[PDB]
Assembly symmetry: C3
Homo-oligomer: 245 residues x 3
């Protein structure tokens, strides 16, 4: 399978102040190289699209997205898709990128949204997906408020009574350090739950298959133990295959 | 016809980062200056009040606003009214400025609010007009959440079935690139809709007339095509004459 | 009486810009220094715990907090408790600090929360306590949206019919410049109100006593009329004695 994987490294800008004075330091954080590694190890052929490309070169055509068996959006807020540089800084007229994605799913394409601070509703409600059009595509309902459920203690998920390829191979989950609180839509399937809330949900949107994972595939919610985990590489591949065109 | 126009230029402070290092550049983005000239070309005598002046020398009396036939508020959030330098840095007691505006309208004042990231509920719910004395003055209900509807692809508003002098001269709107999502109150008149939502809303507040335009008069929601439109200047002049005292 | 007092000074970072260029200046505001000097000298033994001490060395066992009669949280967001440095930057696993306070209170410890921008729901909803274990502990329900009610004109609180030790010695309040808007829960007693909303709410959490004060013990809501009040010091001492474990 061929997938489009949309994600990015956090940029970090650090102001250091003492008394009157300040200096800065800056750096980056590294996204999901590990998850991308795992996906290349499994069958999967991946096109990584960083947030920068999305902002500057996002495809303007359904056909441009047709060769992908599935799309993944990992911890990028909607603003990034809706306020591309040409829209925000030039006032060119540009296709709704999110509508393209939703159109692409309706024709059989698969979609996976992976949680984090910039997923679903997100920290300070900045991911803001509920107000988008994708809302209608996801097998979940989102909150109005900041989404995060922070779990410094850690908390481990339990699989669901539902039996599924993704979830068959294992039973004990590794600790996760948080997730986006979601509500499952009526006719969707919850495969695991965390702190009583849903963790993995599947639904369809017309012809296409949709999946939400409510925690992050990486730090800090995706704990060292979760990245470690014997089942991590295959879990992710199964999910991808479960939504294949 | 004599009006008080409250608005401003955006200030932009830009942090450029690469590896360890940053440098910064700064500029101003240019506000409603186009609209101001247009009003001046019609009847209208305009007192331009920048948010700087709102912050330092806002009138302390609703009699001081009384020489104005209307007050326009353009994409300036409530914080700017409620947290004048006196109040916020010095704890000096002063009249709630939104209340003076409310009083002013009640005694027959016109009020226009023009949308943007800092109108109504606003980007990230920052403009925050809902939790404000002005919420009952306006002919609209507002969302608890981030208001914005972004239309990178643009969207042409339509005139409603209500007939009006404002909307009389033209049938077809130029595209706009976003608007605040609002709900028309009961006794209010919707003259135009965009994307199935109210664009232009007239109502009353005791003896005063009130208007809500849900998009922006400037970039980036205000498309160039909007700005260059043969009707733009007469539309805004009309809107003002309409809400005159 | 020995209490844990949790708060901080504001750090201020200032970007000054003019045309292209900027420079910066930075400083500190001030925490509850007055209020602390007031609590001591009313023979209250006070451990001051700055955020930062919260962020690096926060008690991780029940035994640790047990030697405290009450805990004071003043103007500190939930993020500071949940996202300590070791969770957020180190990827360690530490226990939920707010479970800790909850546990403590249930075991008969007293809690006081003082309002401000990072209390309750807080400014731009950042304090975020409603999506938190403490929500359950507090004698108030919190809003989904931005909590603040700004009162630049100031408003005098009025005592309630309920007779109480805290409330006897005065009847007229000095003006406050804003507060967090809350709603009293059922089994809870409101001892004072401001602008027709709760200001002093008393309650219990299993074996423990809880108190919410809806305004700030310091600037800018905490007016100079409030700090120079005759009843100021005694008022807080009484609040504390009222929640002594």
């Amino acid at each position: 399978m061929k997938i489009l994987f949309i994600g990015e490294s956090w940029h970090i800008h650090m102001i250091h102040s003492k008394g009157f004075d300040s200096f800065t330091s800056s750096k980056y954080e590294e996204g999901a190289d590990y998850l991308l590694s795992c996906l290349r190890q499994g069958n999967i052929d991946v096109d990584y699209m960083p947030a920068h490309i999305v902002q500057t070169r996002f495809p303007q055509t359904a056909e441009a997205l047709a060769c992908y068996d599935a799309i993944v959006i990992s911890d990028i807020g909607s603003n990034t898709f809706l306020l591309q540089n040409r829209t925000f800084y030039n006032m060119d007229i540009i296709p709704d990128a999110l509508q393209l994605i939703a159109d692409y799913v309706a024709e059989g394409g698969g979609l996976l949204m992976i949680g984090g601070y910039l997923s679903f509703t997100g920290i300070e409600a900045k991911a803001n997906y509920k107000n988008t059009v994708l809302a209608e595509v996801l097998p979940v309902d989102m909150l109005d408020v900041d989404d995060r459920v922070e779990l410094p203690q850690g908390c481990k998920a339990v699989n669901t009574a539902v039996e599924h390829v993704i979830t068959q191979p294992f039973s004990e989950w590794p600790p996760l350090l948080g997730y986006n609180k979601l509500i499952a839509k009526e006719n969707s399937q919850v495969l695991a739950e965390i702190n009583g809330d849903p963790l993995l949900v599947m639904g369809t949107y017309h012809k296409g298959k949709v999946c939400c994972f409510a925690s992050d595939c990486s730090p800090h919610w995706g704990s060292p133990q979760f990245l470690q985990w014997e089942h991590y590489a295959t879990f992710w591949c199964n999910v991808l295959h479960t939504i294949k065109k």
